[PDB]
Structure formats: C-alpha cells, structure tokens
C-alpha cells in the first residue's frame, strides 16, 4: 500500500509556541492529505483538507503545507485548548485509505494517598489496597509496598495515565491484591514513594482494624 | 439544517458469532453519498474497516475483514447495516460511521468530517474512603474501584455528569484470570466532605450493569 | 510539478495493464495512473500560458481531466474483484482520451527556421573563402 510516516508520534511543548508536525508519504499522492485533531475520546474533527487548506470552521492559527512528498501541519499559536493525537491521512481512493499513527501533544512533588479495602471486599475473600500518586512529572518513580518491614515481588500492579489537558503531568495507582488470610496475618500496611522532585522517599502507613 | 450520523447497535457478540451494526443518518440523503465505517482500536491511532458505496450498492472490505464482513443499506430511512461474522477482541473498538461525497467537485475534496459519537461476567465496584488524618481545610482524595468485568472497558462517571473538575480515571490493567480492573479518583477540598455526597456511577454495557456507589470518610 | 512529467508516468503505466497477470498488477499501475492525473489537472498547458483561471478552455481543460479520472473510475472497482479480463477491457478508452487533450505547429516553424540560419551562414561564409583563397 501507500504507507504514511508520521513524525513525531508524541511531543511535549509549551503554551502559545510554534509546533511543526511532519509526515512523509511512501509513494506519490497528488494533493490528498487530510489532517485531524483528535481530542481525548470525543468526536474527531477535520483541520486540513487538500493538504494546505483550512476547514470551514477551524481557527487560522493552524495551517498546512504540501511540498512534493513532504506534508506538514504548522501550529503558530498553540493555545491550551488545542492538544491532541493529530493525523495525516491520505484520501486517494476509497478502498486504499490509510491514516497516520498520530501526533500527541499535551499542554512539583505529587501528592500521595493510601486507600484500604472495605468490609464488603473482605467478605468476598480479596484484599485490595491502593497507593495513589497525583500531579507528578516525569513518568519515572519508585513505589514500594511495605508489609511489616518486608518487601514484596510480583503481586502488585501499576497504572499510569496520559499527560494532562492543563499541565502535562502524571497520576499513578499502585494496587496490591492479596487474600484475606494474608491480610489478617499481618497488621501494618505502608507504601513508600521515591521520586526526583521529592526530597525524601515518603512512607504513608495505616494499621488494621 | 445540519448533517448528523448516529451510531448504534453496540453490545456483546457471543464467541464465534455475528452482529449487525446500524448507522442512522439524519438530515441528509444516502443515495448520493458513500458511507464508510472506521474503527479505533484503543490506546492506538486509527485503522479503517470497510466502506459501502450506496450509489451502486458496492462495498470494499479490508484484508482484516474479507470473508467475514457484509454491508448493506436501506435508502428509505437512511440506514446502514454492517454484518460482522466470527469476531475477535481486536475488533473491540470505537466504531464510527462516515460520510463522503462524489467526484467531481469540491465535495470530493471534503473528506471524512462528520464523525459520530462512536460505539464500543459483570463488575464489582468498591468505595475508596479518605483518611481521618486529613488536614483541616486542605486536600483529600477519594474514589471507586471497578474490577472483574468481561469485556474491557467500563465507563465511569461522577454525580451523573455534574463533576468534571479534578477527576482522574485510569486505563485498566489485565489480571491473572483474564479479567480487567481499574480505579477512578477525585481530589477535593476537605471542607465539603460533611456537606456534599459523592457518588461514582459505573456502566458496563455488554454485561448491562449500571451501579451507583456513594463514598464517605471513615470513622 | 509539470504536465509532461506526469505523462512520463502516465504513458508507461498505461501499456502495462493491458495484458497483465494478477489483480495487483492492475492495482499498482492504477494507483500510479490516478495520482499523476490529479497533479496534471492542477497544471497549465504551455500554449495557453497567458490567460485567466476562469478561461473557457481552462475549465474545458479542468473538466477534461474529470473524464479521465472518471474513466479511471470504471476499472477501479472491477480490480477489487480479481477480474483479469474486465480491468483491461474497460480501460481501452484511455488512448482516445490522451488524443483529445494534446493541447504546436506554430512553435515548430521557429525551430526548423532557426537551424537553417545556423546552416546557411556556414555555407555563405565558407563558400566565398572557398573561391578566393588560392589567388591571395
């Protein structure tokens, strides 16, 4: 087919600044590139049809440019209402329509909290304890569960979201799942966080009962 | 005055089975417009499924869906019917129906632009209480945990859509049993904990489950 | 781009689809035939260089390439069907539609005019030297 090489897959850049998005087609397409802003989860919208022309109802800070094989979406004043997973896309013939892989722009120690399991969870036979890290940047961290000064391995999971709509940060949930017998044989539950922006690895604890 | 396109029929296919999707196109005709169908596999970019040209009935399937997919349309009440046989969990996607005009003209150059609202064992949701050692007039965290649902995902809302400030929902991580689970948290000022109640509302559409659960601080 | 550079891809891709083997050999050369056709449609022929965009022949140029992509459009959806016959048999009208836009005698009577002035000035100068030179 006619593949479409996005550059980049994601980027991270400032408020108001000029941001370039390039795409190179893999063989000759005449003028048929459409560029799409893709918001988190809603209806997608068309920015650029016929590779340089604005859609009827799109702001004129964005523009497009064809130059042979090079197709480039230019963002002059990238406002805070403008971050997305952007798309070059060919529209040569209806059965050979290919997209781009996307261009993902998004527009301080993170607060920590702990969350014990409830009694209706404890009646079912499972014990799920949550350590939560909000509003941190960048993505690297060290979250460690401490059960009566002992280290665990392989029985916890982590979940990391996308960068935000306002301030491009991260949020993390570390979930430790155990049985009810392993919850009742021990008493102290703590989660500790090591991070670059925080001066000390913070430990937050609770006791059973 | 607007062209609008409504996507429906979303649910579960029994494993191995078939299902028919419906797109109702309100406001405009279908006999002078090709109608395409495009999905989004989640966490990824974009990936086109199939099309039908309703000027002659004719359709083109991708190399993923040849032998397995069959589209027709009704031109009376402006509807599109897409036939899905022997599916997979990489079909578990956001499905949109789409418009395209015909050659010649500027409406050929008008691409895909009318993109719809999209279609996609039952879960258990458990409340996540703030601690009693929170600071007076500061910042407290609360939430709800959804687990054990086939298939992925759930949709989580707060106070029937009245709260959009400070929400953080998460992508789900697969457990050892083949099951999915996530958590959803809200940061709040601590002075409104004894005045305003906070209810998580979780929907899981193939299991047809609606669940509301309130959260309170512990004592 | 250029008009005749697109016909440098449109000529050699037109003669390959006629007796070809498989359905992708129709389909790869038809993607070369469509994508060069729209870029030539944006262009300007050189004998009609000095006019307006809304001239009556320039629209008749620009709807005259709608016929050719529309007669690309006959053999497009048959080439999804795997028919080795019906692709090339419906694409025999492409050579007639290259004939209708050939848009050249008034330029070529400058080119044959100018080379004889650099041929007869050789003979008229060296002919007089070819007479008078052994007596002097």
Domains of chain B by residue range? 4-109, 124-215
- Whether chain B has a CB inside 8 Å of the CB on A99: the answer is yes
Q: Check whether residue A101 and residue A118 sit in a common domain.
A: no
CB-based contact A113:A121 (threshold 8 Å): no
Q: Which of C63, C70, C77 sits opposite B58 (nearest CB)?
A: C77
- Whether chain A has a CB inside 8 Å of the CB on B106: the answer is no
Residue with tokens 């941190």: A136
Q: Which of B109, B128, B139 sits opposite A111 (nearest CB)?
A: B139
Q: Which of C2, C31, C33, C70 to mutate to test the interface with A (most CBs of A within 10 A)?
A: C31
DSSP state of B119: B
CB-CB under 8 Å, B115 with A44: yes
Number of Cβ within a 10 Å radius of residue A31: 19
A58, A60, A61, A64 alpha-carbon torsion, rounded to 10°: 90
Q: Check whether residue A121 and residue A203 sit in a common domain.
A: yes
CATH code assigned at A137 = 2.60.40.10
User: Neighbours of B (≥3 Cβ pairs closer than 8 A)?
Assistant: A, C
Q: H/E element holding C3?
A: helix C3-10
Chain C closest CA to B103's CA: distance in Å? 8
Radius of gyration, alpha carbons of chain C = 24
Chain A closest CA to B77's CA: distance in Å? 24
Phi, psi of C99 (to 5 degrees): -75, -30
**Tokens, residue B110:** 């008008």
Q: Which residues pair with A206 in a beta bridge?
A: A189
* The dihedral sign for the CA sequence B155, B158, B159, B162: negative
Q: Which of C36, C42, C76 sits opposite A28 (nearest CB)?
A: C36
Phi, psi of B65 (to 5 degrees): -115, 15
CA distance A24 to B31: 35
Last residue of a domain, one of A50, A74, A106: A106
CB-based contact B181:A158 (threshold 8 Å): no
Last residue of a domain, one of A106, A139, A163: A106
Kindly report the CATH class assigned to B4-109.
Answer: mainly beta
Q: Which of C39, C76, C80 sits opposite A30 (nearest CB)?
A: C39
Using a 10 angstrom Cβ sphere, with 0-12 exposed, 13-18 middle and 19 or more buried, the burial of residue A115 is buried
CB-based contact B38:B98 (threshold 8 Å): yes
Residues of C with CB below 8 A from A30's CB?
35-39, 42
Give Cα B5 distance to the centre of its chain. Answer: 16
Last residue of a domain, one of A52, A73, A106: A106
Using DSSP, state whether C112 is helix, strand or coil. helix
CB-based contact A127:A180 (threshold 8 Å): yes
Residues of B with CB below 8 A from C23's CB?
none
CB-CB under 8 Å, C32 with A30: no
- Whether chain C has a CB inside 8 Å of the CB on A95: the answer is yes
Experimental method: cryo-EM
Instruction: Give whole-number Cα distances, B213 to A125, B132, B143, B165, in Å.
Output: 20, 20, 10, 19
CA distance A157 to B139: 26
Q: Check whether residue A20 and residue A49 sit in a common domain.
A: yes
Chain B closest CA to A138's CA: distance in Å? 17
Instruction: Give whole-number Cα distances, B111 to A73, A190, B8, C66, in Å.
Output: 17, 55, 23, 18
- Whether chain B has a CB inside 8 Å of the CB on A176: the answer is no
A126-136 and A111-115: which strand pairing?
A: antiparallel
Chain A closest CA to C119's CA: distance in Å? 43
State the Cα angle at C73 between B31 and A70, rounded to 5°.
105
Q: Which of B60, B141, B170 sits opposite A113 (nearest CB)?
A: B141
Residues of C with CB below 8 A from A27's CB?
31, 35
Chain A closest CA to C19's CA: distance in Å? 22
Q: Check whether residue A181 and residue A140 sit in a common domain.
A: yes
- Whether chain C has a CB inside 8 Å of the CB on B67: the answer is no
Residue with tokens 């593949």: A3
Which stretches within chain B are classed as H helix? 106-109
Residues of A with CB below 8 A from B47's CB?
99
B79-85 and B94-100: which strand pairing?
A: unpaired
First and final C-alpha spacing in chain B: 57
**Tokens, residue C8:** 């440098």
Residue with tokens 């050189």: C46
Q: Check whether residue A119 and residue A26 sit in a common domain.
A: no
Residues of B with CB below 8 A from A94's CB?
34, 36, 51, 53, 60, 100
Phi, psi of C31 (to 5 degrees): -75, -25
Q: Check whether residue A86 and residue A123 sit in a common domain.
A: no
- Scored b (16 or more CB within 10 A) or e, A138-171 reads eeebebbbbbeeeeeeeebeebeebbbeeebbbb
CB-CB under 8 Å, C69 with B103: yes
Q: Find the helix packing angle between C3-10 and C23-41, rounded to 10°.
A: 170
Residue from A65, A59, A62, A75 nearest A31 by CA:
A65
Residues of B with CB below 8 A from C66's CB?
103-104
CA distance C78 to C84: 9
Q: Check whether residue A138 and residue A65 sit in a common domain.
A: no
| Closest alpha carbon within chain B to C65 | B104
CA distance A192 to A173: 13
Give Cα B197 distance to the centre of its chain. Answer: 27
Residue from A100, A23, A114, A4 nearest A66 by CA:
A23
Work out how many domains chain A is built from and give that number.
Answer: 2
- Scored b (16 or more CB within 10 A) or e, B41-57 reads eeeebbebbbbbbbeee
DSSP state of C14: T
CA distance C1 to A30: 10
Using a 10 angstrom Cβ sphere, with 0-12 exposed, 13-18 middle and 19 or more buried, the burial of residue B178 is exposed
Task: Determine if residue B15 is left, alpha or beta; phi over 0 gives left, psi from -120 to 50 gives alpha, anything else beta.
Answer: beta
Q: Check whether residue A121 and residue A98 sit in a common domain.
A: no
Residues of C with CB below 8 A from B65's CB?
none
Residue from B157, B89, B144 nearest B120 by CA:
B89
**Tokens, residue A40:** 């988190």
In this structure, chain C runs to a length of: 136
- Whether chain C has a CB inside 8 Å of the CB on B109: the answer is no
Instruction: Give whole-number Cα distances, A17 to A7, A80, B46, in Å.
Output: 18, 10, 27
| Closest alpha carbon within chain A to B106 | A50
Q: Check whether residue A169 and residue A76 sit in a common domain.
A: no
CATH code at B124-215: 2.60.40.10
* The dihedral sign for the CA sequence B131, B137, B138, B141: positive
**Tokens, residue C58:** 């320039």
- Asked if omega into A159 is within 30° of 0 (cis), the reply is no
Residues of A with CB below 8 A from C76's CB?
93
- Whether chain B has a CB inside 8 Å of the CB on A163: the answer is no
- Whether chain B has a CB inside 8 Å of the CB on C106: the answer is no
- Written as one string, the DSSP assignment of chain A is ---EEEE-SEEE--SS--EEEEEEESS--SS-EEEEE--SSS--EEEEETTTEEPTTS-TTEEEEEETTEEEEEESS--TT---EEEEEE-SSTTS--B---EEEE--PPEEEEE---HHHHTTTEEEEEEEEEEE-SS--EEEEEESS-B--SSEEEEE-PPPSSS--EEEEEEEEEEHHHHHS--EEEEEEE-SSSSS-EEEEEE--
Chain A closest CA to B190's CA: distance in Å? 14
CA distance A129 to A114: 8
A103-106 and A156-160: which strand pairing?
A: unpaired
- Confirm whether B4-109 and B124-215 share one CATH topology: yes
- Whether chain C has a CB inside 8 Å of the CB on B104: the answer is yes
Chain C closest CA to A68's CA: distance in Å? 8
Q: Check whether residue A9 and residue A97 sit in a common domain.
A: yes
* The dihedral sign for the CA sequence B1, B3, B4, B5: positive
Q: Check whether residue A151 and residue A120 sit in a common domain.
A: yes
CB-CB under 8 Å, C63 with B103: no
* The 3-state secondary structure of B199-211, one letter per residue: EEEEEECCCCEEE
Sequence-distant (6+) residues with CB within 8 A of B21 are B7, B8, B9, B10, B37, B80, B81, B82, B84, B95, B119
CA distance C33 to A97: 17
Q: Check whether residue A60 and residue A136 sit in a common domain.
A: no
CB-based contact B47:A99 (threshold 8 Å): yes
Q: Name the residue range of residue A9's domain.
A: 4-106
């Amino acid at each position: 087919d006619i593949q479409m090489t996005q550059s980049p897959s994601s980027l991270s850049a400032s408020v108001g600044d000029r941001v370039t998005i390039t795409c190179r087609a893999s063989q000759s397409v005449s003028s048929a590139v459409a560029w799409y802003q893709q918001k988190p989860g809603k209806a997608p919208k068309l920015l650029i049809y016929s590779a340089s022309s604005l859609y009827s109802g799109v702001p004129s800070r964005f523009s497009g440019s064809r130059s042979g094989t090079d197709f480039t979406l230019t963002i002059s004043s990238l406002q805070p209402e403008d971050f997305a997973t952007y798309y070059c896309q060919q529209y040569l013939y209806y059965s050979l329509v290919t997209f781009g892989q996307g261009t993902k722009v998004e527009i301080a120690a993170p607060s920590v909290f702990i969350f014990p399991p409830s009694d209706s969870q404890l009646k079912s036979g499972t014990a799920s304890v949550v350590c939560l890290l909000n509003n941190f940047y960048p993505r690297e961290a060290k979250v460690q569960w401490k059960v009566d000064n002992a280290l665990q391995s392989g029985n916890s999971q982590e979940s990391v979201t996308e960068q935000d709509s306002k301030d491009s940060t991260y949020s993390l949930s570390s979930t430790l799942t155990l049985s009810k017998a392993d919850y009742e044989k021990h008493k102290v539950y703590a989660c500790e966080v090591t991070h670059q922006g925080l001066s000390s690895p913070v430990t937050k604890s609770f006791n059973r009962g | 005055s607007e062209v609008q396109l409504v996507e429906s029929g979303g649910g579960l296919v029994q494993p191995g089975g078939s299902l028919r999707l419906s797109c109702a196109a309100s406001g405009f005709n279908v006999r002078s417009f090709s109608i395409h169908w495009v999905r989004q596999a989640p966490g990824k970019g974009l990936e086109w499924v199939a099309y039908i040209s309703s000027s002659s009935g004719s359709t083109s399937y991708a190399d993923s869906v040849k032998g397995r997919f069959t589209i027709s349309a009704d031109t009376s009440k402006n509807t599109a019917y897409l036939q899905m046989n022997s599916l997979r969990a990489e079909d578990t996607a956001v499905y949109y129906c789409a418009r395209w005009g015909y050659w010649p003209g500027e409406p050929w150059w008008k691409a895909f632009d009318y993109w719809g609202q999209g279609t996609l064992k039952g879960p258990s949701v458990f409340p996540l209480a703030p601690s009693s050692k929170s600071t007076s007039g500061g910042t407290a965290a609360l939430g709800c945990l959804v687990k054990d649902y086939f298939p992925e995902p759930v949709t989580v809302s707060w106070n029937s859509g009245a709260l959009t400030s400070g929400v953080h929902t998460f992508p789900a991580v697969l457990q050892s049993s083949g099951l999915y689970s996530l958590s959803s948290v809200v940061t709040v000022p601590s002075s409104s904990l004894g005045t305003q109640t906070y209810i998580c509302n979780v929907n899981h559409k193939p299991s047809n489950t609606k669940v509301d659960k309130k959260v309170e601080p512990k004592s | 781009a250029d008009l005749e550079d697109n016909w440098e891809t449109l000529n050699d891709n037109l003669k390959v689809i006629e007796k070809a083997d498989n359905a992708a050999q129709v389909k790869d050369a038809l993607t070369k035939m469509r994508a060069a056709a729209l870029d030539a449609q944006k262009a300007t022929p050189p004998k009609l260089e000095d006019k307006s965009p809304d001239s009556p022949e320039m629209k008749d140029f620009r709807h005259g390439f709608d016929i050719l992509v529309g007669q690309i459009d006959d053999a497009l959806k048959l080439a999804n069907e795997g028919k080795v016959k019906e692709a090339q048999a419906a694409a025999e009208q492409l050579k007639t539609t290259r004939n209708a836009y050939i848009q050249d005698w008034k330029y070529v009577a400058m080119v044959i005019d100018r080379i004889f002035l650099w041929m007869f000035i050789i003979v008229c100068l060296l002919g007089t030297v070819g007479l008078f030179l052994p007596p002097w």
